[PDB]
Design a protein around this ligand. Structure first.
Ligand SMILES: CC(=O)N[C@H]1/C(=N/OC(=O)Nc2ccccc2)O[C@H](CO)[C@@H](O)[C@@H]1O
Ligand SMILES: CC(=O)N[C@H]1/C(=N/OC(=O)Nc2ccccc2)O[C@H](CO)[C@@H](O)[C@@H]1O
Lengths: 575, 575
């Protein structure tokens, strides 16, 4: 076969790029699809779109791939991180070029200048500055000046990410192009932009976790919430209490060693991603605890009587030794997850029946004058949480914010009996319309939104117990994730919302299915959290298709949203 | 870290392998999970389970990986295919061994003997013999005799596949094991066991197509139905009418050349998979036909008025030149798809409105005394099909069976006016309970079942036009595909059912998402078609989990069905 050449061209008409034949008898220069898209779309090819200035100009300039140089103007303690970020950037620019295509090495030279105004700052915090400014302009006759200015390394890295998005490959001519005149100013609306990955229901290769982080960085998501343990498995390698992993793991290979974790944590830091660890308690414990006598109900049957899902099992708060185990686990986590400013302690629904089933437990309650009703079991949960919390603080070596899921414990009506708003952040998984949300906000609580009607990425597949479909079906499309707005959910109490997180529970997901589950749906969340657009999904639709293509180019096995024909023929596919 | 060793063992109790600690003070030999499973389960680790004799014995023998030799007893015209099949088999045995694990090179030597009774036979046909017999027994002191006897290469290749499934890796000891005493006899219930892949709505890499075929072969699926063109794109490289692909393709790279197609066809043949091509007509045409004047309504707006989905477009049957184009396309297909015994001609619903919209068309109808009502448009469709059919036969150089989808044309009430049962096979996509099915069967028609309620693999994701979920949602779980029985659907007219096919329409699928869409759900279909079990999904559940793990080992990014904990702890997860 003699491979053909691209035969089509694209022209902007009413905000839509229309495909037209590239006829020879024309004096007007043909535009490639991406080139037309960059100026046809209001925000061009950017995802997420910026919150401030977004001036992309009207032109593109041909660039030579081998002539891109990055210079770091202000040196500091973040030099290593900055140097790493710069290196990644050269590689990102290539992603513009489709695989198997080769650009002509001609054109201008690009100079990228990074101005990090506080070069020593590298800690993750809810108050950290993620803002940046980007300007691109012609410099002299043969080069381009790209200048990124930010208050911190984090803003600077976000700026490099936006800059990488200003490159387009012209497949008609085989030219690498770059936007000529750019003025951009940006910062995120919300500090916490996350993805929860459950690695206990099924194991995820460390390569996959890193790939996930690479994708997150590409859309300015900053938090990876590692739900490391559950009743099904204990893959965290705890040096202090090694039997938990030894007994706990699905296999000896299916484990997360200290070196692997440091590796992931560092990989995250370079990409502005906080790796936040969760040790869920006192429910969701099982495997790895055999022979300790520190749990009750593991594998209790019938399972339905004792828990939400099999296997059943919970910690026994009445055993003093448990707090010793917990201290050790929290300490081992703190050692390796050393960039995190926050610790998640789980707290999803505890089972009354399960606790009531232990005489050892009942005796303890009897001795303490408490009865055996629901109110009393709440007392037991609080007793546990208070003790666990002390251990967590001791482990991290300071008081730090702690996260808990919405639960019976966190009901706004009695939450103050147990928790306080300064010390606890509440992760919300109820529907976006649930009354608990307003009530919690009124009490001053900060929230992370993960409402299941919009943010549960596991939803919609086949049932994993029995037949039918899984519990939270239907499957949530990107359109729905995009339209779910925390600002709408919280109204006037908006500042109290820290952000949001997409949740990938793993009863039905693993190394193999993760790219699909997460991408590009998490990108919808990324834009929503970064920008809080007043606009709807339909306004972001064309760009969403582009970002999906970009994730694929990165090597992500992203879900397919629409026929490629739609991407090539804007406005034709609608409903 | 010092990697641990597996700490658990498994014991059979009431058909379930239960995990127990591998305690040192025991005189009873510990069993690894797969080893326990092989004898605990009624059919062991086999998928699909055999239809005849299935005696697996009670024991396992240690085997040396480097000592497996295959000898072909009867030579013939299929020598090349047999030699290829043998080579693949050595590689398959390794799949038993999990990645990064290394077996001890000790144990017996395995001799595999292949007896192909009709060594010259290599054609695909509905009447072909896929039966085989398998016996395994100890031979002498240091070796194993594995003998496969079949009427044809196809049965022989199915036998090698079953034999590869009789190997287990003992991860407790690092020993490769094989079932010691085996007697198996098998043949499929249905001749046509397929997967439809739509490569026009989105493009699929040829590497992906081959990977799909590898997975199919692993579960004895024998037909790959390539839905090569549609309105969205024309990736088939037709030498005779090169503009269709040149204009038609999503990109110059996104094409299927003759060499690629031969490559896929050959890869299929070696694995007992018929590669069946579909050129859908007269609807579902669009791209690639610009400037021919041979279509009407391409990109007609509003799309809803003229078609099921955008872009709209149909062939104009009144143009004589069209039949010339068609002859050329059919001829180009016949040249490269040279193993197929059947040709699929599409025929999914044609649009009346679209045809009525062309005066050129109306004039033709006016001249032929036909009116402009629905009945008349049916006449036009028949006129087209009759002419297209003649071209198809001329292209293939013989009369061969042709397949059409259920449609207005195929309504059993008037189907005989147009088609005949000898010449046409009807592919059914209505619900399994639709009256058309009984009516068609009563008229003597053969069917391929693809009922959308059970067999549409595209179903359940987000909407691709507008918001919500896609048209045939909910998502179909393996349980549902497994329970859908053609025997039940057809009753006494069972023989008329040729088999079944899972359909992966590609509006929302591509190279990236294909492993997930297809696997392991197609495996459910494979067993149902191969064996027609009276039993339900729950009886096949443990084995299904194993096959999924096997697909992953093969490199398939298969969907995750359940937590791995369930696989390790049978009977604990249920509902
Ligand atoms: C916080 C959370 O989501 N907890 C569990 C969880 N709990 O789900 C419910 O209990 N849903 C529910 C059941 C009855 C009534 C209301 C909600 O869902 C995930 C799967 O989607 C599990 O992986 C989690 O462990
Ligand atoms: C045979 C077939 O399935 N045809 C089209 C097709 N047609 O679907 C329907 O028209 N479904 C339907 C609509 C209204 C009433 C009954 C069925 O579905 C696939 C997507 O699932 C498309 O890719 C196919 O081109």
């Amino acid at each position: 076969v003699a491979a053909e050449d691209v035969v089509w061209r694209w022209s902007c008409d009413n905000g839509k790029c229309v495909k037209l034949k590239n006829d020879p008898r024309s004096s007007e220069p043909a535009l490639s699809l991406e080139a037309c898209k960059m100026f046809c779309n209001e925000y061009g090819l950017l995802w997420p779109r910026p919150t401030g200035e977004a001036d992309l100009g009207n032109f593109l300039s041909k660039i030579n791939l081998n002539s891109i140089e990055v210079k770091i103007l202000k040196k500091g303690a973040t030099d290593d991180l900055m140097e790493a970020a710069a290196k990644r950037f050269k590689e990102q620019v290539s992603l513009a070029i489709p695989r198997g295509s080769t650009p002509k090495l001609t054109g201008k030279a690009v100079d990228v200048y990074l101005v990090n105004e506080n070069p020593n700052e590298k800690a993750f915090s809810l108050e950290m500055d993620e803002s940046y400014g980007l300007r691109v302009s012609p410099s002299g006759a043969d080069r381009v000046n790209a200048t990124i200015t930010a208050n911190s390394f984090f803003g600077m890295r976000h700026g490099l990410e936006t800059l990488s998005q200003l490159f387009v490959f012209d497949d008609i001519r085989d030219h690498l192009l770059m936007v000529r005149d750019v003025n951009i100013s940006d910062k995120p609306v919300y500090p916490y932009r996350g993805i929860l990955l459950d690695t206990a229901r099924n194991y995820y290769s460390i390569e996959s976790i890193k790939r996930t982080i690479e994708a997150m960085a590409a859309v300015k998501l900053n938090t990876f919430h590692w739900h490391i343990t559950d009743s099904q498995s204990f893959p965290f390698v705890t040096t202090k209490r090694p039997n938990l992993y030894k007994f706990g793991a699905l296999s000896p290979q299916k484990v997360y060693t200290k070196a692997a974790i440091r590796e992931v944590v560092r990989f995250g830091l370079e990409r502005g991603v906080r790796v936040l660890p969760e040790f869920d308690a006192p429910a969701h414990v099982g495997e790895g605890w055999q022979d300790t006598d520190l749990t009750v109900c593991f594998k209790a049957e019938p399972w339905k009587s004792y828990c939400g899902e099999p296997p059943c099992g919970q910690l026994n708060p009445t055993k003093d030794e448990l707090y010793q185990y917990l201290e050790d686990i929290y300490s081992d986590m703190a050692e390796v997850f050393d960039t995190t400013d926050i610790f998640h302690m789980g707290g999803d629904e505890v089972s009354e029946a399960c606790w009531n089933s232990s005489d050892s437990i009942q005796n303890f309650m009897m001795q303490n004058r408490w009865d055996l009703d629901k109110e009393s079991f709440l007392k037991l949960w609080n007793y546990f949480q208070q003790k666990a919390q002390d251990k967590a603080y001791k482990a991290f070596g300071k008081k730090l914010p702690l996260i808990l899921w919405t639960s019976t414990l966190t009901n706004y009506k009695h939450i103050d009996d147990y928790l306080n708003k300064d010390d606890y952040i509440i992760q919300v998984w109820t529907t976006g319309v649930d009354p608990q949300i307003k009530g919690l906000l009124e009490k001053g609580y900060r929230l992370i939104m993960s409402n299941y009607d919009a943010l549960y990425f596991d939803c919609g597949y086949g049932a994993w117990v029995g037949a039918g479909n899984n519990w939270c079906s239907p499957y949530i499309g990107w359109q729905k994730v995009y339209d779910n707005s925390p600002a709408v959910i919280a109204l006037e109490h908006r500042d109290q919302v820290l952000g949001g997180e997409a949740a990938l529970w793993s009863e039905q997901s693993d190394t193999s299915t993760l790219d699909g589950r997460l991408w590009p749906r998490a990108a919808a969340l990324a834009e929503r959290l970064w920008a809080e657009p007043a606009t709807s999904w339909q306004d972001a639709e064309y760009r969403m298709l582009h970002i999906r293509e970009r994730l694929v180019r990165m090597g992500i096995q992203a879900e397919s949203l629409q026929p490629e024909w739609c991407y090539q023929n804007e406005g034709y596919c609608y409903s």
